[PDB]
Amino acid sequence: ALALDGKLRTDSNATAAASTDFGNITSALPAAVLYPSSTGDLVALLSAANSTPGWPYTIAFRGRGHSLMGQAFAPGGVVVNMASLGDAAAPPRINVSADGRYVDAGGEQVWIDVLRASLARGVAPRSWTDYLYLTVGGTLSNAGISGQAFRHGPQISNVLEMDVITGHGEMVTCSKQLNADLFDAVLGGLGQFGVITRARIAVEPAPARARWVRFVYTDFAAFSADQERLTAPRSFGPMSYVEGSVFVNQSLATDLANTGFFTDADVARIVALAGERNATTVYSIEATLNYAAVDQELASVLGTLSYVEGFAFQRDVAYAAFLDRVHGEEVALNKLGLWRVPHPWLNMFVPRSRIADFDRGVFKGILQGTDIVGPLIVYPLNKSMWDDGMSAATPSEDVFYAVSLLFSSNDLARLQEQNRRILRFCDLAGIQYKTYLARHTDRSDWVRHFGAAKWNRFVEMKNKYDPKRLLSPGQDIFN
Ligand SMILES: *Cc1cc2c(cc1C)nc1c(=O)[nH]c(=O)nc-1n2C[C@H](O)[C@H](O)[C@H](O)COP(=O)(O)OP(=O)(O)OC[C@H]1O[C@@H](n2cnc3c(N)ncnc32)[C@H](O)[C@@H]1O
Ligand SMILES: *[C@@H]1O[C@H](CO)[C@@H](O[C@@H]2O[C@H](CO)[C@@H](O)[C@H](O)[C@H]2NC(C)=O)[C@H](O)[C@H]1NC(C)=O
Ligand SMILES: CC(C)=CCNc1ncnc2[nH]cnc12
Ligand SMILES: *[C@@H]1O[C@H](CO)[C@@H](O)[C@H](O)[C@H]1NC(C)=O
Ligand SMILES: *[C@@H]1O[C@H](CO)[C@@H](O)[C@H](O)[C@H]1NC(C)=O
Ligand SMILES: *[C@@H]1O[C@H](CO)[C@@H](O)[C@H](O)[C@H]1NC(C)=O
Structure with a gap:
């Protein structure tokens, strides 16, 4: 047939x-x-x-x-x-609502296209992933996390309703008001219960621009305390997005340059700083403020922080350019044949109470003396913005950290062994992490x-x- x-x-x-x-x-x-x-x-x-x-x-x-x-x-x-569902010109697979308060997107649709369709109507989703060439159905089957999740929750906390075809072959519309059991199950449900053919995504009036900062630390305690300060409930502070990254000494200059944020002069200054301090690890908070008023607002927030004076680095970009930042990274890496390589990525959620221990064992321990290629991302999340009735699993603490060690690969076996070793360290330390x-x-x-x-x-x-x-x-x- x-x-x-x-x-x-x-x-x-x-x-x-x-x-x-x-x-x-x-x-x-x-x-x-x-x-x-x-x-x-x-x-x-x-x-x-x-x-x-x-x-x-x-x-x-x-x-x-x-x-x-x-x-x-x-x-x-x-x-x-799934992509085949979006082949036809009409009818559209992305519909911004008449009042602009939500966007309906086909499960197969990629978030970059949801962004573009939303911006055409002056609106945009509130909660993102770092990388936009992922499907609506795919991220919603996991959680969907980025630097906005601390204040808006993951993407699964920003869905109004879905159409799902179950394993019984029944098309079901589900929400908190209707077939809520299926709704909760599918969200973070790892594709186990049915296929999302449409998801209703919350939107907000689209900001035009983002003031985009990186702050440098040599002290993990200061770095993590400041991330927690920026993401703490007041309702939240002014920052629209908060992430962080870790840079090991051996590949410091290379990894800093690979962010795409720091100029060669910027990198040199940070390398010099690490040197004077004999630092084995450098940390950077990455934050944005969506919008002379910005200058003062930013200055006020930065004044609450404890990054190394002289080490705040600023960019100012169109909102859409910030959101799609990783696309440019893929294009550059692909040209050098460094994108389509094995990715033994390690992603987990680490409870706040043990993040310093994790830093000691992993960033200051296991990863030291290796050539790291790929970002090491670390940032706090607020459990309050997650629905524990949904399938996604998180640590029990009010605050837990996304830890995403995005290794690019004789290297593969080494990296696989290294990941096993990191997990072994966590288990032996009794850290109650959840994988993602x-x-x-x-x-x-x-x-x-x-x-x-x-x-x-x-x-x-x-x-x-x-x-x-x-x-x-x-x-x-x-x-
Ligand atoms: C490749 C990658 C992934 C990634 C990322 C950056 C890169 C370069 N950045 C992420 C981020 O910042 N935050 C985040 O939460 N995730 C990030 N990802 C990981 C990504 O979310 C996952 O790869 C996810 O699987 C989405 O990818 P994709 O859309 O390509 O989905 P898939 O891999 O083909 O399928 C994943 C599982 O879900 C089931 N599935 C897929 N579509 C549906 C629908 N429509 N309905 C129900 N289930 C679905 C698949 O069967 C599979 O099990
Ligand atoms: C976007 O809205 C349009 C309505 O304009 C939807 O198109 C209809 O889709 C159904 C089945 O999906 C078809 O039977 C109708 O013929 C379509 N109508 C029109 C006017 O073309 C479309 O489904 C919506 N997309 C999503 C993902 O919700
Ligand atoms: C959760 C997850 C897999 C995040 C991945 N994020 C990223 N993946 C690949 N490149 C990146 N550059 C900045 N952030 C990047
Ligand atoms: C699923 O299969 C059962 C037979 O065991 C049948 O009664 C039911 O109609 C089926 N549903 C669909 C939508 O195919
Ligand atoms: C950083 O690594 C380089 C080798 O790549 C080494 O010369 C230097 O001693 C290291 N710095 C510290 C303080 O560990
Ligand atoms: C990984 O990609 C390479 C191309 O560089 C391909 O030859 C290989 O078969 C792929 N391996 C797997 C397991 O997907």
Whole structure:
């Protein structure tokens, strides 16, 4: 039925393209790839899967395949090429509401396109990812975090409603008011319960510009205290975005230059500072203020901080240019063949009470004396802005840190071993971290990830919405 319409492809080129991801570490060939022209095609697949005894195929939903460890694969199954839903010129897959208070976006749509459509109506989503070439459905199946999340929550806290087709092949509209169980399950739900075909995203009046600062520290305690100050509830302070980065001594000049923020003269000044202080690690807060009034507002906030005097660095850019900053980084790295490489990324949420310990063991310990390529990102988040009824798992403390160690790769085995060593350190130290963007490979690890109560809920939702255990098998939770 679908295959004859050219939609279900089994040819080598189709299966090969759906067999690798951004991680570039694991691969798994699907039996077939669906190229749906409409949500009707997805209903048809899931309905067939639901109603057919001896249905052979697991089903994954490939967004843009930005997964690190095969989460978007369907080994010997069917991968849905979600992008196909956006092929047709009409009808539009992104609709800003009549009053401009939300934007409807297809699950397959990339956030960069949501941005552009929103800005055309003078509005924009409030909560982002660092990198915009990711799908709406993909980030919402994880959490979606960036420097705005401290004050607006992750992207999953900025969804009004969704259309989801479940593993039963039923199209369901869900929200806090209707089918809330599915709504909560799908958000951070790792593609386990159904496919998001549309999500209603909160927007705000679009700021025109961002004053964009980097502040330099040699002292982790000062660096982290200041991040916590900037992101503390008052309602929040003036900063629109707060992240941070870590720079190890061995690759200091190189890693500073690789931010794309510091000029060569800037780098030289920071290298000189680290030298005089014999610092093994340098830290930088990255913050923005969306908008002479800016000058005074910025001066007032900076006055509350304790970065090294002389080491505030400023840029002033269009809001959209700030948001899409990493696109330029990809273009540059790709030209040098340094983008499409293995990415043994380590991402976790570390409770505030143990972040100094993590710094001691990892940044001042394990990572020392290595050539680091890729950003090491660290910044606090506020639990209050997360909904613990949703599937996403976070640490128990009111404040926890996003720690994203974005290693680019004989190097791969070394980096993989290093990541195991970091996790070993955390476990031995009794740090109650949660992984993010990682898949686990046995039951006990997944149960630990969610905790007993949330796991049991996760299973209840799985039985309700995907009883055959077909969906997103690359997460290795039920497969
Ligand atoms: C590649 C990368 C990823 C990334 C990032 C920067 C880069 C260069 N920066 C991020 C950031 O700042 N903050 C953040 O939260 N995440 C960031 N990411 C990671 C990214 O969110 C994940 O890669 C995520 O998976 C989104 O990527 P993508 O849209 O390409 O989705 P996928 O990898 O193909 O699929 C992931 C899982 O979700 C299921 N899925 C996909 N679409 C749907 C829909 N529509 N409905 C239900 N489930 C869906 C897949 O089956 C798979 O399991
Ligand atoms: C954006 O809005 C348009 C309405 O203008 C939606 O287009 C309709 O979509 C349904 C099914 O998705 C079709 O049966 C109709 O024929 C379409 N109407 C028009 C006027 O073309 C579109 O679905 C919306 N997009 C999203 C993702 O919500
Ligand atoms: C959570 C996560 C994977 C964030 C990734 N962020 C980024 N990923 C790749 N390049 C970047 N440059 C700045 N931030 C970058
Ligand atoms: C990673 O990318 C390279 C191209 O540089 C490719 O040859 C290789 O097969 C990929 N590996 C995986 C597991 O995706
Ligand atoms: C799912 O399958 C069952 C048969 O066990 C059937 O009763 C139901 O109609 C199916 N739903 C859809 C939408 O295919
Ligand atoms: C920083 O690393 C360089 C080698 O790359 C070394 O010469 C220097 O001693 C290191 N600085 C400190 C204080 O660790």
